[PDB]
PDB file of C-alpha atoms in Angstrom:
ATOM      1  CA  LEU A1316     -13.779  -4.218  -3.108  1.00  0.00           C
ATOM      2  CA  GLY A1317     -13.185  -2.142   0.002  1.00  0.00           C
ATOM      3  CA  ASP A1318     -12.939   1.437   1.271  1.00  0.00           C
ATOM      4  CA  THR A1319     -10.559   3.636  -0.734  1.00  0.00           C
ATOM      5  CA  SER A1320      -9.708   6.021   2.105  1.00  0.00           C
ATOM      6  CA  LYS A1321      -7.486   3.984   4.471  1.00  0.00           C
ATOM      7  CA  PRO A1322      -3.701   4.449   4.734  1.00  0.00           C
ATOM      8  CA  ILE A1323      -1.036   1.933   3.684  1.00  0.00           C
ATOM      9  CA  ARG A1324       0.528  -0.237   6.393  1.00  0.00           C
ATOM     10  CA  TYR A1325       4.157  -1.339   6.053  1.00  0.00           C
ATOM     11  CA  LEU A1326       5.248  -4.620   7.642  1.00  0.00           C
ATOM     12  CA  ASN A1327       8.736  -5.953   8.325  1.00  0.00           C
ATOM     13  CA  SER A1328       9.675  -9.603   8.865  1.00  0.00           C
ATOM     14  CA  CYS A1329       7.918  -9.285  12.228  1.00  0.00           C
ATOM     15  CA  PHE A1330       4.314  -8.156  12.777  1.00  0.00           C
ATOM     16  CA  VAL A1331       5.118  -4.574  13.851  1.00  0.00           C
ATOM     17  CA  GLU A1332       4.689  -1.546  11.603  1.00  0.00           C
ATOM     18  CA  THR A1333       8.035   0.147  10.976  1.00  0.00           C
ATOM     19  CA  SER A1334       9.750   2.584   8.628  1.00  0.00           C
ATOM     20  CA  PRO A1335       8.880   2.249   4.917  1.00  0.00           C
ATOM     21  CA  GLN A1336      12.517   1.682   3.920  1.00  0.00           C
ATOM     22  CA  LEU A1337      12.921  -1.242   6.345  1.00  0.00           C
ATOM     23  CA  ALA A1338       9.698  -2.936   5.219  1.00  0.00           C
ATOM     24  CA  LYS A1339       8.918  -6.241   3.517  1.00  0.00           C
ATOM     25  CA  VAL A1340       5.181  -6.506   2.745  1.00  0.00           C
ATOM     26  CA  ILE A1341       2.816  -3.788   1.493  1.00  0.00           C
ATOM     27  CA  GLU A1342      -0.821  -3.912   2.642  1.00  0.00           C
ATOM     28  CA  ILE A1343      -3.161  -2.049   0.276  1.00  0.00           C
ATOM     29  CA  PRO A1344      -6.582  -1.665   1.963  1.00  0.00           C
ATOM     30  CA  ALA A1345      -8.469  -1.535  -1.348  1.00  0.00           C
ATOM     31  CA  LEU A1346      -8.029  -0.985  -5.084  1.00  0.00           C
ATOM     32  CA  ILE A1347     -11.551  -0.980  -6.573  1.00  0.00           C
ATOM     33  CA  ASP A1348     -14.024   1.339  -4.864  1.00  0.00           C
ATOM     34  CA  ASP A1349     -17.301   0.000  -3.463  1.00  0.00           C
ATOM     35  CA  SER A1350     -19.374   3.049  -4.488  1.00  0.00           C
ATOM     36  CA  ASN A1351     -19.135   3.514  -8.271  1.00  0.00           C
ATOM     37  CA  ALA A1352     -16.510   0.898  -9.253  1.00  0.00           C
ATOM     38  CA  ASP A1353     -13.706   3.454  -9.266  1.00  0.00           C
ATOM     39  CA  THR A1354      -9.952   2.838  -9.406  1.00  0.00           C
ATOM     40  CA  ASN A1355      -7.257   4.321  -7.167  1.00  0.00           C
ATOM     41  CA  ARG A1356      -4.010   5.184  -8.952  1.00  0.00           C
ATOM     42  CA  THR A1357      -2.259   6.299  -5.760  1.00  0.00           C
ATOM     43  CA  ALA A1358      -1.805   2.698  -4.604  1.00  0.00           C
ATOM     44  CA  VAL A1359      -0.251   1.562  -7.883  1.00  0.00           C
ATOM     45  CA  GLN A1360       2.022   4.624  -7.904  1.00  0.00           C
ATOM     46  CA  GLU A1361       3.212   3.792  -4.376  1.00  0.00           C
ATOM     47  CA  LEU A1362       3.689   0.156  -5.402  1.00  0.00           C
ATOM     48  CA  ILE A1363       5.775   1.236  -8.402  1.00  0.00           C
ATOM     49  CA  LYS A1364       7.959   3.525  -6.297  1.00  0.00           C
ATOM     50  CA  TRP A1365       8.391   0.904  -3.556  1.00  0.00           C
ATOM     51  CA  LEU A1366       9.191  -1.930  -5.985  1.00  0.00           C
ATOM     52  CA  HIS A1367      12.613  -0.382  -6.633  1.00  0.00           C
ATOM     53  CA  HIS A1368      15.754   0.548  -4.698  1.00  0.00           C
ATOM     54  CA  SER A1369      13.451   2.614  -2.430  1.00  0.00           C
TER      55      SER A1369
END
């Protein structure tokens, strides 16, 4: 229930944003839109591609 226009931040073991390949935790700003209860398929596609050998 947030804003579906923010980028995706990648976090390593530390608290500094780094390269996507050397990342540990994915931070999705929002999934369900706060305007007309929409859904964003970009985030799930990125999650699917990242949850692999990357």
